[PDB]
Amino acid sequence: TQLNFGQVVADVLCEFLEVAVHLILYVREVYPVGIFQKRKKYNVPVQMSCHPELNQYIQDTLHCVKPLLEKNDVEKVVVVILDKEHRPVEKFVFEITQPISSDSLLSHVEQLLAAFILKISVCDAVLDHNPPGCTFTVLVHTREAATRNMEKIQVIKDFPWILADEQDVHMHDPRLIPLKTMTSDILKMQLYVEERAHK
Amino acid sequence: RTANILKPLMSPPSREEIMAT
Amino acid sequence: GNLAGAVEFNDVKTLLREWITTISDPMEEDILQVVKYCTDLIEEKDLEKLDLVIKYMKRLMQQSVESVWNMAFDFILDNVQVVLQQTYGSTLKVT
Ligand SMILES: Nc1ccc(/N=N\c2cccc(F)c2F)c(N)n1
């Protein structure tokens, strides 16, 4: 609604991401259904792990990312599903784009973010079944390479960050499945999935 | 030459670690 | 275990000698490429090569008048340590 700098933009996105990451883990069966509880976000059913270590890893991840969004340093936030052999299978990719105050305009972008969630809910329909034994990682693409980025993310202790290898990024013959694009003045975000040729 | 991609050093807990109460 | 093309260790000192002593504002991409080289020495279980590259870099970068290189080395070392602190439970002793 009201008050604070470019860091409701940041807590909006972070909250959105917490829900997004949780729901991706549910719809792509990365963890058993057992650990999940139905819940309500953006006036839309979502799903949310209450295994507290998983919840912490995701929380710690996004807390580290907050600072980079506050100053709009992030090109994309990628949820990578790896197979049981550590090989990238598919990529949920949030592309985020840069462009006074806020008021009840915010409760307009809360609305636009519901469609993303719904897109994720029913996205088994546009994507091949995933192979079993998958895990997941988080990649952050920054706008340009900058030490200020690596010093802003290395906040949370016991949770350091590294520069990803090519074995962490590369996906061969990747097919593109766009889920949702969105233009407000504050936020311009695309969600698209990069999917391997075969699994 | 790809120094704009960051990643947690730590992995999320595995399917195993979870499938064990 | 590769720094911008260099695999062997006498090659990697060639580069860092060249890069630190010629240039006067190091490109940020370069400083991160070196952090990645370093963090790769840790995964690859080569602490001797890690102490050796850190010891070298400390000589040239701290003997600079240009606080640019003094702070480069402070950024590099800080990143190596958080990663050694979490995979070995210790920090490099730097004499
Ligand atoms: N634009 C750059 C990139 C890296 C640099 N450091 N040494 C290199 C020189 C050429 C190629 C290369 F890969 C190098 F690492 C540099 N002085 N400028």
Distance from residue C30's CA to the centre of ligand 1 (Å): 7
Provide the phi-psi class of A43: left if phi over 0, else alpha when psi is between -120 and 50, else beta: left
Give the HSE-up count for residue C33: Cα atoms under 13 Å, Cβ half-sphere: 16
What are the φ and ψ backbone dihedral angles of A46, each rounded to 5 degrees?
A: -130, 175
Q: Which among A43, A195, A173, A57 has a CA at the least distance from the CA of A118?
A: A43
Assigned token pair, A99: 């462009």
A142 min Cα distance to partner chain B (Å): 5
Note whether A99 and A112 are within 8 A (CB): no
The domain containing residue C85 runs over which residues? 1-95
Strand residue runs (E) in C1-95: none
CATH number at residue C34: 1.20.58.1280
Pick the CATH number of A2-199 from 3.30.900.10, 3.10.50.40, 3.40.50.2300, 3.50.50.60: 3.30.900.10
Phi, psi of C62, rounded to the nearest 5 degrees: -85, -25
All residues at 6 or more sequence positions from C86 whose CB lies less than 8 Å from its CB, including other chains: A158, A160, B9, B10
Domain count, chain C: 1
Of the candidates A88, A106, A99, the one whose C-alpha atom is nearest the C-alpha of residue A169 is: A88
Report resolution in angstroms: 2.5
Give residue C71's region: left, alpha or beta (phi > 0; psi -120 to 50). alpha
Please state, in angstroms and rounded to a whole number, the distance separating the CA atoms of residues A81 and A62: 17
Question: Are A158 and C86 a contacting pair at CB < 8 A?
Answer: yes
Contact A58 B12 (CB under 8 A): yes
